[PDB]
Amino acid sequence: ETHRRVRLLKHGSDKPLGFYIRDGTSVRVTASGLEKQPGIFISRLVPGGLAESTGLLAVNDEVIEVNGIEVAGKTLDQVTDMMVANSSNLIITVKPAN
């Protein structure tokens, strides 16, 4: 599988995970062939932030699931809420851009 699971071990309750997400499009494979579908992607990393420090997350990476739950069919607002809830010990499944 091309998917990669990243665990962000945060300590500061106020300090953010260190990244931004945006709406995007993903041309995933299907039966009839490649097809476009909505998706969530990392737009950028906070300088000096936790996410950047790990070196496991990068811009354009696609968020597939948050702590075991797929983000497919959800809005940017809903996915954002899903992540801040697991800030303490967040596990994110992504699909590397590069």
């Binding site: 995970l17 997400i21 945006r22 709406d23 737009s43 906070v46 607002d77 954002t80 800030s87």
Partner: peptide, 6 residues
């Protein structure tokens, strides 16, 4: 682009 910080 609209982005959301986490």
């Amino acid at each position: 682009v609209k982005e959301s910080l986490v």
